[PDB]
Amino acid sequence: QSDTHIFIIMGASGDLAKKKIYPTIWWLFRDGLLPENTFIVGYARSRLTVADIRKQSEPFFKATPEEKLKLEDFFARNSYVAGQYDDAASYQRLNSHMNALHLGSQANRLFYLALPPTVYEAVTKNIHESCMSQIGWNRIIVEKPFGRDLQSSDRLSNHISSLFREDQIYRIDHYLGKEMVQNLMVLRFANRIFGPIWNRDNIACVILTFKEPFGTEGRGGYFDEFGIIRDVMQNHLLQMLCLVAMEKPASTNSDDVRDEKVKVLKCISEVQANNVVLGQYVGNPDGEGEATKGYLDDPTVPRGSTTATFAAVVLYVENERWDGVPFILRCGKALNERKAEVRLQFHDVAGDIFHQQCKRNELVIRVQPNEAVYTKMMTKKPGMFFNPEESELDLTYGNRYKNVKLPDAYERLILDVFCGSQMHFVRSDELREAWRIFTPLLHQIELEKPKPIPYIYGSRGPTEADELMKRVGFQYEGTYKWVNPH
Ligand SMILES: NC(=O)c1ccc[n+]([C@@H]2O[C@H](COP(=O)([O-])OP(=O)(O)OC[C@H]3O[C@@H](n4cnc5c(N)ncnc54)[C@H](OP(=O)(O)O)[C@@H]3O)[C@@H](O)[C@H]2O)c1
């Protein structure tokens, strides 16, 4: 478009703006992906100049010498307004500043809230009252947390919705910006090989996994307030569940997609303790550096905290496609690897003619690291043998698409806000369902304070988690052997 566009970084002085938002909007700018007439306005409490923003942020830009002119033009299009987050006069100054930009009263305005949630309500109120374009569109970009339970999320939502239409609100769940998460829809709905088997007649279980190999890294006191279910399970994992489970949408229009996601969540009952395993990591005495330290060995964590650093939970989608199929959500810190993954395990073939030698087929979508899709399946054992053995059909992006840069999630998502595409942003009704599913459990945990099961730093987590997975119908043999073909 030829319209002026203004990108307002609310909280421009903070760490997140410095290390992530300023570098992302630079990358989009550098790559020629933004509108020609774009300006960037920082707003925060400190009395900073553009030269200070540049000094703090440009080390994270990965700028090259050849980009020097583009960089000069980028900083020429930047400005900074000092102000407080609930001061009417400050927002007035911000509005006037924006009006003074080239066609500024006409401009489309995008507000990125690079702020803590304790100022969300004051910032949204003030933007609405003072800084909205009367001609351009107005879009607000908000990051987690969105409440900490159903009642607290409803309060924020009801505040924002009283001021902003759903088509002005862009709630980030950054998994929705990742390459292979966005692929889930194409894989499922562009292919006949995945279509007729994607149902309860063929699928024994679905496993949605998020593992990190580091602990809390001295920042445990922050984590301790919310825990792993609020951090990862209620948002990122549940989003992956929705994209795995959803019926095929009427179109790829933003709200046809998000309608199908909500429809999935509305069929999920509130999870109970029965289907939950919680863990907390302890130090590995045979380990090195951080790995010798448990969760309670972080001095910012409250003494005797029972906060879980690991959760496995089983949900069920109560509908025709999914009736009975367990969806296992599993996540933890200080585990054996970094990995996020979707895995479908297929049922056994009926009418076995291979004398119980066959294993269940599996489809794996590995989100990170090392983006890949593969199907574990049976082939005749190569050479002079007749017995089936497990093998796979593989697609690895690092080998197949060596030269192709995959954008960071924040690159993709910020660009989507410019384009007005809400497909990959969390809708108000979707948010509410997510909290409805998990709030009873979260409240029970806060009330009864169950003691999480210790697991050692660097392990796969508590063995009770594997037991839960087996109980609900996941089969593990440990016979599959993969050799990296390179
Ligand atoms: N293109 C590629 O890069 C590619 C393609 C094919 C295979 N491979 C590699 O080959 C290796 C094996 O592949 P895979 O992980 O798909 O198959 P797998 O080793 O058969 O593992 C299947 C699943 O079982 C889980 N598990 C492990 N022990 C368990 C237990 N005792 N009880 C219950 N569940 C258990 C694993 O958990 P975890 O998630 O905790 O391990 C994994 O989720 C992996 O390293 C994989 O990365 C790579």
Numbering used by the authors: 28 to 513
Quote what the paper states about this structure.
To elucidate the molecular basis of the reduced stability and activity of Canton G6PD, we examined the crystal structures of WT and Canton G6PD at 1.9 Å and 2.6 Å resolution, respectively. Although no NADP+ was added to protein solution prior to the crystallization, both crystal structures contained NADP+ at the second NADP+-binding site (structural NADP+-binding site) in the β+α domain. The overall conformations of WT and Canton G6PD were very similar, as indicated by a root-mean-square deviation of 0.6 Å for the superimposition of Cα atoms. In WT G6PD, R459 forms electrostatic and hydrogen bond interactions with D181 and N185 on the adjacent helix (αe), whereas Canton mutation does not, resulting in loosened inter-helical interactions and displacements of the helix (αe) and a proceeding loop consisting of K171, P172, F173, G174, and R175, several amino acids away from R459-interacting residues on the helix (αe). In particular, K171 and P172 are the key residues involved in positioning of G6P and NADP+ in their binding pockets. We further mutated the R459-interacting residues, D181 and N185, to alanine in WT G6PD to determine the importance of the inter-helical interactions and found that these point-mutated enzymes are biochemically similar to the Canton variant; they exhibited about 20% of the normal activity, with lower KM values for both NADP+ and G6P and lower T1/2 values. Taken together, these data support the importance of the inter-helical interaction between R459 and D181 and N185 for catalytic activity and stability of the enzyme and provides a structural insight into the biochemical defects of the Canton variant.
Reduced glutathione (GSH) provides the cellular first line of defense against oxidative stress-induced injury, which can be maintained by NADPH generated mainly via the pentose phosphate pathway and its rate-limiting enzyme, glucose-6-phosphate dehydrogenase (G6PD). Accordingly, missense DNA mutations that impair G6PD activity or stability result in increased oxidative stress and a spectrum of disease phenotypes featuring, most commonly, hemolytic anemia, and collectively called G6PD deficiency. Each monomer has a catalytic nicotinamide adenine dinucleotide phosphate (NADP+)-binding domain and β+α domain, containing an additional binding site for NADP+ that structurally stabilizes the enzyme. The glucose 6-phosphate (G6P)-binding site is located between these two domains.
